[PDB]
Amino acid sequence: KPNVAIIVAALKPALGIGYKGKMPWRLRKEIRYFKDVTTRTTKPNTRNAVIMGRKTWESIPQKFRPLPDRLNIILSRSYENEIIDDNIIHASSIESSLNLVSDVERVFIIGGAEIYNELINNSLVSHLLITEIEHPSPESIEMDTFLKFPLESWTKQPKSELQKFVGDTVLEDDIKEGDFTYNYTLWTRK
Ligand SMILES: NC(=O)C1=CN([C@@H]2O[C@H](COP(=O)(O)OP(=O)(O)OC[C@H]3O[C@@H](n4cnc5c(N)ncnc54)[C@H](OP(=O)(O)O)[C@@H]3O)[C@@H](O)[C@H]2O)C=CC1
Ligand SMILES: COc1cc(-c2ccc(C)cc2)cc([C@@H](C)C#Cc2c(C)nc(N)nc2N)c1
């Protein structure tokens, strides 16, 4: 079984990720980081998979779906475990989707809230790619959906380990867009 990882961007310290079905920020560089990391592979003729909840899939703009160069896995409790096309798979669970995929190097859980909060405690998930976002006044930002992540049982890895994981991908420190400041982090289980 290939390595599964959670990729998310959240605002400290309450780890908020959204407000009424949409993200409370537009971080141009973070968006680019998300695309490169979930797309790049190390071995030839392989591709990564992106697993998401049905609601997240529907929120993605028509021309951006499915996410290009990646296998899109959409999760719903009403779906049968079946391959829709070359890039789209419907599944009722992550373990069921892993049995249908082929030539998949890395798997990335990309949201949303219900998906994160109920897969963070799944043994299949071994890595957390959290983009920690800081703001002068976090409470000033409208938020209603948060992450229920027990980071207590996780360990913040050194930047060098994240660099190894992302390869030649540029990792900048304290990226400042507007009033937001963020960093890319890698987490592993205790
Ligand atoms: N900052 C970030 O990195 C990101 C933030 N977000 C935020 O997340 C929010 C949306 O989250 P949310 O509304 O929870 O949407 P989700 O993507 O989590 O959709 C939830 C749906 O997924 C399906 N599902 C949930 N759990 C399971 C399971 N265990 N097995 C199979 N299917 C399951 C269900 O589909 P069904 O009802 O059909 O059975 C459910 O309705 C937005 O506000 C957005 O801003 C999202 C992505 C990234
Ligand atoms: C609301 O419509 C959306 C659009 C995109 C999207 C579409 C195209 C491109 C090039 C980049 C992102 C992604 C999303 C969701 C799936 C996400 C995300 C996510 C992020 C942006 N960063 C990090 N770090 N983790 C994530 N899961 C929703």
Distance 75 CA to ligand 1 centre (A): 8
How many Å apart are CA 120 and CA 117, to the nearest integer? 6
N- to C-terminal Cα separation, the chain: 21
What's the domain count of the chain? Answer: 1
Q: Tell me the C-alpha to C-alpha distance, in Å, between residue 138 and each of 10, 21, 76, 146, 172.
A: 11, 19, 32, 13, 22
**The tokens 């896995």 sit on which residue?**
73
With a 6 Å cutoff on the Cβ, whether 121 touches ligand 1 is: no
**The tokens 């229920």 sit on which residue?**
148
Name the residue range of residue 108's domain: 1-190
How many residues does this entry show for the chain?
Answer: 190
Token digits for 116? 């994160």
Q: Which of 77, 96, 149, 185 to mutate to test the pocket of ligand 1 (most atoms within 8 A of CB)?
A: 77
How many Å apart are CA 36 and CA 169, to the nearest integer? 8
Token digits for 139? 């409470």
Single-letter amino acid code for the residue at 59: S
CATH number at residue 84: 3.40.430.10
PDB resolution in Å: 2.2
